[PDB]
């Protein structure tokens, strides 16, 4: 279970991403307004989804995307895919966002306004992690793209769910809208980098056949 | 001179992109502020760079990206890359953005505020084209990713230039910031779709060979 590449092989997100919005910048005004719009729908359906989207454990990630990609994803039925899910979280959720995160150590909204998020358990961890850019977003975006490369006919569904997965971080109170916008781009950049790695290409080929197999088809 | 895929073979942007920010939406107030922040620096160097970025002819894209990718890009030294640049404009700038564009027919900022853009020439065309999402943006994002795949040693430079190319559209007055943000997602999605098209893979192999050819480096 070795990541497709080492941390040093991720494209330096600190170099290509712009800096997060400043205190008096219109973009930050938007971040704050966006934060409160999410807070308003606390306890609604969309808000409960955001809470579920908060958990990136492979199990929950498989449960969420299985219907979207249209195939049952599981350790037994889809071995390579199962490893692909975890591997991508490592290079995309963490390695790809690392330099930028540490460089700015941006404070999270729920910390700023001293509020509770949609997933209280993860709060002590979040507090220690730089807000910009969002790892969940980078991972979901990357994931949507990889699965779309494996099952092209579910592209629109994957692209859509990938987008909402990111928005859940805004609604959940864990991230500023600007952290999510930057996370999507980080996920795309990582996705391109993976294309040049043999290990990734081998894994994709197997992932492709598992999710296209008639026995694993799901409605 | 044959597009990688037909207009119908691109992922439907109207389905996966959210609708454009509305009049009282937080994102829209940000769009207006961003528009004026750019209109204010009209005539400055950054603004002049925006007019340069506004021109998507192949000759101008090559001039801008040769330094970034680190290789000469010409119809004579890199014919395949030359076609790749033009082909990506069709599938990524036009096909990939069409459905969302036509469905919302979002009014462009310069049209709404009665001002001129950083490149008057285009304004008559822009007038009748849906603002959301931005075609220049999807294109430069796509371009950046494809070139990064051909020469990963320049991934960061490419990813930064690609981003700025999209921001020129906002500074230029041609788009709202939200169109640009949407355009980047479209660029990535289309990038994913191209991977599964043989004509593309075959073309990328040649592009990689031309851009890494010692006789073509700067």
Short mmCIF file of C-alpha atoms in Angstrom, two decimals:
data_model
loop_
_atom_site.label_atom_id
_atom_site.label_comp_id
_atom_site.label_asym_id
_atom_site.label_seq_id
_atom_site.Cartn_x
_atom_site.Cartn_y
_atom_site.Cartn_z
CA UNK A 1 0.00 0.00 0.00
CA UNK A 2 2.51 2.59 -1.19
CA UNK A 3 1.22 5.94 -2.47
CA UNK A 4 1.62 6.32 -6.23
CA UNK A 5 4.25 8.96 -5.55
CA UNK A 6 6.14 10.57 -2.67
CA UNK A 7 5.19 13.90 -1.00
CA UNK A 8 7.98 15.66 -2.92
CA UNK A 9 6.39 14.59 -6.20
CA UNK A 10 3.17 16.54 -5.63
CA UNK A 11 3.13 19.83 -7.53
CA UNK A 12 4.01 22.59 -5.03
CA UNK A 13 0.55 23.96 -4.27
CA UNK A 14 2.18 26.94 -2.54
CA UNK A 15 3.66 28.01 -5.87
CA UNK A 16 0.62 27.96 -8.18
CA UNK A 17 -2.18 28.94 -5.83
CA UNK A 18 -2.92 32.60 -5.08
CA UNK A 19 -2.80 33.61 -1.39
CA UNK A 20 -6.01 33.34 0.63
CA UNK A 21 -8.26 36.46 0.72
CA UNK A 22 -7.08 39.21 3.06
CA UNK A 23 -9.06 40.75 5.93
CA UNK A 24 -10.47 43.68 3.95
CA UNK A 25 -10.61 41.95 0.58
CA UNK A 26 -14.05 41.59 -1.05
CA UNK A 27 -13.30 37.87 -1.39
CA UNK A 28 -13.16 37.53 2.38
CA UNK A 29 -16.43 39.40 2.73
CA UNK A 30 -17.86 36.75 0.44
CA UNK A 31 -16.32 33.96 2.57
CA UNK A 32 -17.99 35.33 5.69
CA UNK A 33 -21.36 35.79 3.99
CA UNK A 34 -21.12 32.30 2.54
CA UNK A 35 -20.32 30.92 5.99
CA UNK A 36 -23.50 32.30 7.53
CA UNK A 37 -25.71 31.05 4.67
CA UNK A 38 -24.54 27.54 5.44
CA UNK A 39 -25.08 28.07 9.15
CA UNK A 40 -28.71 29.06 8.50
CA UNK A 41 -29.72 25.66 7.08
CA UNK A 42 -28.40 23.86 10.16
CA UNK A 43 -30.45 20.70 10.67
CA UNK A 44 -31.78 20.53 7.12
CA UNK A 45 -31.35 17.69 4.61
CA UNK A 46 -28.45 19.34 2.77
CA UNK A 47 -26.83 20.00 6.14
CA UNK A 48 -27.12 16.35 7.18
CA UNK A 49 -25.47 15.37 3.89
CA UNK A 50 -22.61 17.75 4.67
CA UNK A 51 -22.15 15.89 7.96
CA UNK A 52 -21.94 12.56 6.11
CA UNK A 53 -19.63 14.09 3.50
CA UNK A 54 -17.41 15.08 6.43
CA UNK A 55 -16.25 11.49 6.97
CA UNK A 56 -13.55 10.42 4.53
CA UNK A 57 -13.06 6.89 5.87
CA UNK A 58 -12.83 4.61 2.83
CA UNK A 59 -16.00 2.78 3.95
CA UNK A 60 -18.10 5.95 3.89
CA UNK A 61 -16.45 7.14 0.68
CA UNK A 62 -17.40 3.86 -1.03
CA UNK A 63 -20.95 4.03 0.30
CA UNK A 64 -21.33 7.56 -1.09
CA UNK A 65 -19.88 7.13 -4.58
CA UNK A 66 -21.07 3.56 -5.30
CA UNK A 67 -24.51 4.75 -6.49
CA UNK A 68 -23.01 7.64 -8.43
CA UNK A 69 -20.46 5.57 -10.33
CA UNK A 70 -23.12 2.90 -10.68
CA UNK A 71 -21.22 -0.02 -9.16
CA UNK A 72 -20.81 -1.71 -5.78
CA UNK A 73 -17.40 -0.81 -4.36
CA UNK A 74 -16.09 -3.13 -1.66
CA UNK A 75 -12.86 -4.82 -0.46
CA UNK A 76 -14.01 -8.23 -1.69
CA UNK A 77 -15.70 -7.24 -4.95
CA UNK A 78 -13.39 -4.38 -6.00
CA UNK A 79 -9.90 -4.84 -4.48
CA UNK A 80 -7.95 -2.43 -6.69
CA UNK A 81 -10.67 0.22 -6.52
CA UNK A 82 -10.73 -0.06 -2.72
CA UNK A 83 -6.97 0.60 -2.61
CA UNK A 84 -7.33 3.35 -5.23
CA UNK A 85 -9.76 5.20 -2.95
CA UNK A 86 -7.29 5.21 -0.04
CA UNK A 87 -4.26 5.93 -2.17
CA UNK A 88 -5.89 9.00 -3.72
CA UNK A 89 -6.76 10.37 -0.28
CA UNK A 90 -3.05 10.23 0.53
CA UNK A 91 -1.66 11.97 -2.56
CA UNK A 92 -4.60 14.28 -3.16
CA UNK A 93 -6.13 14.99 0.23
CA UNK A 94 -2.75 15.36 1.94
CA UNK A 95 0.38 15.49 -0.24
CA UNK A 96 -1.11 17.82 -2.86
CA UNK A 97 -2.33 20.36 -0.29
CA UNK A 98 0.52 20.17 2.25
CA UNK A 99 2.87 23.01 1.27
CA UNK A 100 0.09 25.59 0.89
CA UNK A 101 -1.61 24.50 4.13
CA UNK A 102 1.52 24.89 6.24
CA UNK A 103 2.62 28.06 4.47
CA UNK A 104 -0.50 30.05 5.39
CA UNK A 105 -1.90 28.17 8.42
CA UNK A 106 -5.20 29.94 7.79
CA UNK A 107 -7.73 29.91 10.60
CA UNK A 108 -10.99 28.03 10.10
CA UNK A 109 -14.35 29.82 10.23
CA UNK A 110 -15.83 27.79 13.10
CA UNK A 111 -12.75 28.77 15.14
CA UNK A 112 -13.06 32.44 14.17
CA UNK A 113 -16.72 32.76 15.15
CA UNK A 114 -16.33 30.24 17.97
CA UNK A 115 -19.07 27.98 16.61
CA UNK A 116 -19.70 24.27 16.27
CA UNK A 117 -19.33 22.43 12.94
CA UNK A 118 -21.54 19.70 11.49
CA UNK A 119 -19.12 16.99 12.70
CA UNK A 120 -17.97 17.94 16.29
CA UNK A 121 -15.74 14.88 16.71
CA UNK A 122 -13.27 16.06 14.05
CA UNK A 123 -12.89 19.54 15.52
CA UNK A 124 -9.78 19.00 17.65
CA UNK A 125 -8.03 17.72 14.53
CA UNK A 126 -9.23 20.54 12.24
CA UNK A 127 -8.01 23.22 14.66
CA UNK A 128 -4.44 22.02 14.10
CA UNK A 129 -4.71 21.94 10.32
CA UNK A 130 -4.31 24.93 8.00
CA UNK A 131 -7.62 25.84 6.35
CA UNK A 132 -6.35 26.82 2.89
CA UNK A 133 -6.75 24.83 0.72
CA UNK A 134 -9.35 22.17 1.56
CA UNK A 135 -8.15 18.56 1.52
CA UNK A 136 -11.62 16.97 1.41
CA UNK A 137 -12.31 19.10 -1.68
CA UNK A 138 -9.05 18.23 -3.42
CA UNK A 139 -9.69 14.55 -2.72
CA UNK A 140 -13.31 14.50 -3.89
CA UNK A 141 -12.43 16.46 -7.05
CA UNK A 142 -9.52 14.14 -7.82
CA UNK A 143 -11.73 11.13 -7.04
CA UNK A 144 -14.55 12.31 -9.28
CA UNK A 145 -12.08 12.71 -12.15
CA UNK A 146 -10.39 9.34 -11.69
CA UNK A 147 -13.71 7.50 -11.57
CA UNK A 148 -14.86 9.47 -14.63
CA UNK A 149 -11.80 8.21 -16.45
CA UNK A 150 -12.82 4.66 -15.47
CA UNK A 151 -16.56 4.88 -16.18
CA UNK A 152 -16.94 7.81 -18.70
CA UNK A 153 -20.72 7.40 -19.01
CA UNK A 154 -21.22 8.49 -15.38
CA UNK A 155 -19.08 11.60 -15.90
CA UNK A 156 -21.81 14.18 -15.32
CA UNK A 157 -23.01 12.47 -12.14
CA UNK A 158 -19.43 12.20 -10.85
CA UNK A 159 -18.61 15.82 -11.67
CA UNK A 160 -21.75 16.99 -9.92
CA UNK A 161 -21.30 14.93 -6.74
CA UNK A 162 -17.64 15.91 -6.64
CA UNK A 163 -18.68 19.56 -6.60
CA UNK A 164 -21.27 19.11 -3.84
CA UNK A 165 -18.81 17.12 -1.74
CA UNK A 166 -16.65 20.23 -1.67
CA UNK A 167 -19.55 22.59 -0.91
CA UNK A 168 -20.33 20.41 2.13
CA UNK A 169 -17.14 21.76 3.75
CA UNK A 170 -18.50 25.31 3.46
CA UNK A 171 -21.92 24.35 4.78
CA UNK A 172 -20.36 22.25 7.54
CA UNK A 173 -18.44 25.26 8.85
CA UNK A 174 -15.02 23.65 8.40
CA UNK A 175 -13.88 25.77 5.47
CA UNK A 176 -14.17 29.15 3.80
CA UNK A 177 -15.62 29.15 0.29
CA UNK A 178 -12.19 30.24 -0.94
CA UNK A 179 -10.54 27.13 0.58
CA UNK A 180 -12.89 24.97 -1.46
CA UNK A 181 -12.44 26.88 -4.73
CA UNK A 182 -8.67 26.43 -4.40
CA UNK A 183 -9.05 22.78 -3.42
CA UNK A 184 -10.81 21.95 -6.69
CA UNK A 185 -7.91 23.32 -8.69
CA UNK A 186 -5.40 21.42 -6.52
CA UNK A 187 -7.33 18.21 -7.26
CA UNK A 188 -7.20 18.87 -10.99
CA UNK A 189 -3.44 19.56 -10.88
CA UNK A 190 -2.76 16.37 -8.93
CA UNK A 191 -4.97 14.44 -11.34
CA UNK A 192 -2.76 15.56 -14.26
CA UNK A 193 0.41 14.59 -12.37
CA UNK A 194 -0.94 11.08 -11.72
CA UNK A 195 -1.37 10.49 -15.47
CA UNK A 196 2.43 10.45 -15.87
CA UNK A 197 2.99 7.85 -13.15
CA UNK A 198 3.16 4.18 -14.26
CA UNK A 199 1.95 2.83 -10.92
CA UNK A 200 -1.22 4.94 -11.29
CA UNK A 201 -1.83 3.82 -14.88
CA UNK A 202 -1.55 0.13 -13.88
CA UNK A 203 -3.98 0.60 -11.02
CA UNK A 204 -6.48 2.50 -13.19
CA UNK A 205 -6.53 -0.26 -15.79
CA UNK A 206 -7.57 -2.74 -13.11
CA UNK A 207 -9.98 -0.28 -11.53
CA UNK A 208 -11.57 0.18 -14.95
CA UNK A 209 -12.35 -3.52 -15.38
CA UNK A 210 -13.69 -3.93 -11.83
CA UNK A 211 -16.23 -1.10 -12.20
CA UNK A 212 -17.29 -2.20 -15.68
CA UNK A 213 -17.73 -5.85 -14.68
CA UNK A 214 -21.33 -7.01 -15.11
CA UNK A 215 -21.38 -8.63 -11.66
CA UNK A 216 -20.59 -5.33 -9.93
CA UNK A 217 -23.20 -3.25 -11.79
CA UNK A 218 -25.53 -1.24 -9.54
CA UNK A 219 -28.72 0.75 -10.20
CA UNK B 1 -7.49 19.08 -38.36
CA UNK B 2 -10.00 16.73 -36.72
CA UNK B 3 -11.54 17.48 -33.28
CA UNK B 4 -10.92 14.83 -30.62
CA UNK B 5 -14.65 14.40 -30.08
CA UNK B 6 -17.99 15.86 -31.17
CA UNK B 7 -20.00 18.53 -29.28
CA UNK B 8 -22.33 15.76 -28.05
CA UNK B 9 -19.42 13.74 -26.65
CA UNK B 10 -18.44 16.31 -24.05
CA UNK B 11 -19.75 16.15 -20.49
CA UNK B 12 -22.91 18.30 -20.14
CA UNK B 13 -21.83 21.43 -18.20
CA UNK B 14 -25.44 22.48 -17.60
CA UNK B 15 -25.96 19.32 -15.57
CA UNK B 16 -22.94 19.40 -13.23
CA UNK B 17 -22.31 23.12 -12.75
CA UNK B 18 -24.50 24.97 -10.26
CA UNK B 19 -26.60 27.86 -11.62
CA UNK B 20 -24.86 31.27 -11.78
CA UNK B 21 -25.06 33.56 -8.71
CA UNK B 22 -28.26 35.57 -8.64
CA UNK B 23 -28.89 39.25 -7.93
CA UNK B 24 -29.11 38.92 -4.14
CA UNK B 25 -26.62 36.08 -3.68
CA UNK B 26 -23.40 36.65 -1.67
CA UNK B 27 -21.41 35.36 -4.62
CA UNK B 28 -22.98 37.98 -6.86
CA UNK B 29 -22.04 40.93 -4.62
CA UNK B 30 -18.51 39.57 -4.80
CA UNK B 31 -18.77 39.43 -8.61
CA UNK B 32 -19.68 43.14 -8.80
CA UNK B 33 -16.88 44.17 -6.43
CA UNK B 34 -14.38 42.07 -8.38
CA UNK B 35 -15.59 43.67 -11.60
CA UNK B 36 -14.98 47.20 -10.33
CA UNK B 37 -11.68 46.28 -8.73
CA UNK B 38 -10.49 45.47 -12.24
CA UNK B 39 -12.18 48.34 -14.03
CA UNK B 40 -10.30 50.62 -11.65
CA UNK B 41 -6.84 49.57 -12.86
CA UNK B 42 -7.72 49.96 -16.55
CA UNK B 43 -4.62 50.99 -18.50
CA UNK B 44 -2.09 49.48 -16.08
CA UNK B 45 0.35 46.64 -16.88
CA UNK B 46 -1.79 43.87 -15.36
CA UNK B 47 -4.66 45.21 -17.44
CA UNK B 48 -2.43 45.19 -20.52
CA UNK B 49 -1.54 41.58 -19.79
CA UNK B 50 -5.29 40.85 -19.70
CA UNK B 51 -5.74 42.18 -23.24
CA UNK B 52 -2.85 39.98 -24.32
CA UNK B 53 -4.43 36.96 -22.62
CA UNK B 54 -7.72 37.82 -24.35
CA UNK B 55 -6.35 36.78 -27.73
CA UNK B 56 -6.73 33.00 -28.11
CA UNK B 57 -5.42 32.60 -31.67
CA UNK B 58 -2.85 29.80 -31.82
CA UNK B 59 0.05 32.17 -32.51
CA UNK B 60 -0.68 34.08 -29.29
CA UNK B 61 -1.20 30.99 -27.13
CA UNK B 62 2.14 29.63 -28.35
CA UNK B 63 3.94 32.92 -27.66
CA UNK B 64 2.59 32.92 -24.10
CA UNK B 65 3.16 29.26 -23.27
CA UNK B 66 6.54 28.61 -24.95
CA UNK B 67 8.35 30.31 -22.07
CA UNK B 68 6.24 28.54 -19.48
CA UNK B 69 6.57 25.04 -20.91
CA UNK B 70 10.20 25.68 -21.80
CA UNK B 71 10.13 24.74 -25.48
CA UNK B 72 9.70 26.50 -28.81
CA UNK B 73 6.19 26.09 -30.15
CA UNK B 74 5.86 26.63 -33.89
CA UNK B 75 4.01 25.05 -36.81
CA UNK B 76 7.42 24.01 -38.13
CA UNK B 77 9.29 22.67 -35.10
CA UNK B 78 6.29 21.27 -33.20
CA UNK B 79 3.49 20.61 -35.72
CA UNK B 80 1.61 18.18 -33.48
CA UNK B 81 1.65 20.55 -30.50
CA UNK B 82 0.47 23.25 -32.88
CA UNK B 83 -2.60 21.18 -33.78
CA UNK B 84 -3.10 20.15 -30.12
CA UNK B 85 -3.44 23.83 -29.15
CA UNK B 86 -6.12 24.45 -31.76
CA UNK B 87 -7.96 21.20 -31.08
CA UNK B 88 -8.14 21.85 -27.33
CA UNK B 89 -9.74 25.25 -28.05
CA UNK B 90 -12.59 23.55 -29.91
CA UNK B 91 -13.39 20.79 -27.43
CA UNK B 92 -12.54 22.66 -24.25
CA UNK B 93 -13.30 26.30 -24.95
CA UNK B 94 -16.43 25.75 -27.03
CA UNK B 95 -17.89 22.24 -26.86
CA UNK B 96 -17.30 21.70 -23.14
CA UNK B 97 -18.95 25.02 -22.16
CA UNK B 98 -21.81 25.23 -24.67
CA UNK B 99 -24.76 23.72 -22.83
CA UNK B 100 -24.35 25.77 -19.65
CA UNK B 101 -23.63 28.89 -21.71
CA UNK B 102 -26.76 28.70 -23.87
CA UNK B 103 -29.06 27.60 -21.05
CA UNK B 104 -28.38 30.58 -18.76
CA UNK B 105 -27.37 33.18 -21.34
CA UNK B 106 -25.88 35.10 -18.44
CA UNK B 107 -25.34 38.79 -19.12
CA UNK B 108 -21.70 39.89 -19.18
CA UNK B 109 -20.51 42.57 -16.72
CA UNK B 110 -19.51 45.12 -19.36
CA UNK B 111 -22.94 44.79 -20.97
CA UNK B 112 -24.65 45.34 -17.62
CA UNK B 113 -22.59 48.41 -16.66
CA UNK B 114 -22.15 49.99 -20.11
CA UNK B 115 -18.35 50.01 -20.14
CA UNK B 116 -15.74 48.85 -22.62
CA UNK B 117 -13.48 45.84 -22.13
CA UNK B 118 -9.74 45.36 -22.43
CA UNK B 119 -10.30 44.16 -25.99
CA UNK B 120 -13.13 45.96 -27.88
CA UNK B 121 -12.66 43.72 -30.93
CA UNK B 122 -14.34 40.78 -29.16
CA UNK B 123 -17.23 42.72 -27.62
CA UNK B 124 -19.63 42.22 -30.55
CA UNK B 125 -19.11 38.46 -30.29
CA UNK B 126 -19.23 38.39 -26.49
CA UNK B 127 -22.58 40.23 -26.58
CA UNK B 128 -24.45 37.20 -27.92
CA UNK B 129 -22.53 34.57 -25.94
CA UNK B 130 -23.59 33.23 -22.54
CA UNK B 131 -21.20 34.53 -19.89
CA UNK B 132 -21.40 31.48 -17.62
CA UNK B 133 -19.03 29.65 -17.73
CA UNK B 134 -15.93 31.32 -19.24
CA UNK B 135 -14.58 29.74 -22.41
CA UNK B 136 -11.09 31.27 -22.16
CA UNK B 137 -10.79 29.81 -18.65
CA UNK B 138 -11.85 26.25 -19.42
CA UNK B 139 -9.41 26.39 -22.34
CA UNK B 140 -6.37 27.63 -20.39
CA UNK B 141 -7.07 25.23 -17.52
CA UNK B 142 -7.31 22.35 -19.98
CA UNK B 143 -4.23 23.54 -21.87
CA UNK B 144 -2.26 23.85 -18.64
CA UNK B 145 -3.15 20.29 -17.55
CA UNK B 146 -2.38 18.71 -20.92
CA UNK B 147 0.99 20.44 -21.15
CA UNK B 148 1.74 19.41 -17.56
CA UNK B 149 1.12 15.85 -18.69
CA UNK B 150 3.59 16.36 -21.56
CA UNK B 151 6.25 18.07 -19.48
CA UNK B 152 5.66 17.54 -15.72
CA UNK B 153 8.94 19.23 -14.82
CA UNK B 154 7.05 22.46 -15.54
CA UNK B 155 3.81 21.54 -13.78
CA UNK B 156 3.83 24.38 -11.20
CA UNK B 157 4.69 27.14 -13.70
CA UNK B 158 1.96 25.87 -16.03
CA UNK B 159 -0.62 25.61 -13.24
CA UNK B 160 0.10 29.19 -12.14
CA UNK B 161 0.01 30.70 -15.65
CA UNK B 162 -3.17 28.77 -16.37
CA UNK B 163 -4.78 30.31 -13.28
CA UNK B 164 -3.72 33.86 -14.16
CA UNK B 165 -4.95 33.42 -17.72
CA UNK B 166 -8.40 32.84 -16.26
CA UNK B 167 -8.14 35.87 -13.99
CA UNK B 168 -7.40 38.11 -16.98
CA UNK B 169 -11.01 37.53 -18.07
CA UNK B 170 -12.25 39.11 -14.84
CA UNK B 171 -9.81 42.01 -14.93
CA UNK B 172 -10.68 42.53 -18.61
CA UNK B 173 -14.36 43.03 -17.82
CA UNK B 174 -15.40 40.16 -20.09
CA UNK B 175 -16.53 37.85 -17.26
CA UNK B 176 -17.71 37.75 -13.66
CA UNK B 177 -15.41 35.94 -11.19
CA UNK B 178 -18.01 33.17 -10.83
CA UNK B 179 -17.79 32.39 -14.57
CA UNK B 180 -14.04 31.96 -14.18
CA UNK B 181 -14.30 29.71 -11.13
CA UNK B 182 -16.83 27.57 -13.03
CA UNK B 183 -14.64 27.53 -16.11
CA UNK B 184 -11.78 25.87 -14.22
CA UNK B 185 -13.95 22.94 -13.16
CA UNK B 186 -15.13 22.52 -16.76
CA UNK B 187 -11.51 22.47 -17.89
CA UNK B 188 -10.69 19.65 -15.46
CA UNK B 189 -13.81 17.63 -16.32
CA UNK B 190 -13.06 17.89 -20.07
CA UNK B 191 -9.44 16.96 -19.25
CA UNK B 192 -10.71 13.74 -17.66
CA UNK B 193 -12.87 12.93 -20.72
CA UNK B 194 -9.99 13.39 -23.20
CA UNK B 195 -7.93 10.72 -21.40
CA UNK B 196 -10.35 8.07 -22.66
CA UNK B 197 -10.21 9.13 -26.32
CA UNK B 198 -7.59 7.26 -28.43
CA UNK B 199 -7.12 10.15 -30.88
CA UNK B 200 -6.09 12.28 -27.90
CA UNK B 201 -3.70 9.75 -26.35
CA UNK B 202 -2.05 9.27 -29.74
CA UNK B 203 -1.76 13.04 -30.13
CA UNK B 204 -0.39 13.48 -26.62
CA UNK B 205 2.38 10.95 -27.29
CA UNK B 206 3.63 13.09 -30.17
CA UNK B 207 3.24 16.30 -28.18
CA UNK B 208 5.35 14.83 -25.39
CA UNK B 209 8.03 13.85 -27.92
CA UNK B 210 8.13 17.32 -29.49
CA UNK B 211 8.19 19.27 -26.20
CA UNK B 212 10.96 17.10 -24.74
CA UNK B 213 13.06 17.11 -27.91
CA UNK B 214 16.44 18.67 -27.10
CA UNK B 215 16.34 20.46 -30.45
CA UNK B 216 13.17 22.24 -29.25
CA UNK B 217 14.04 23.34 -25.69
CA UNK B 218 14.84 26.95 -24.74
#
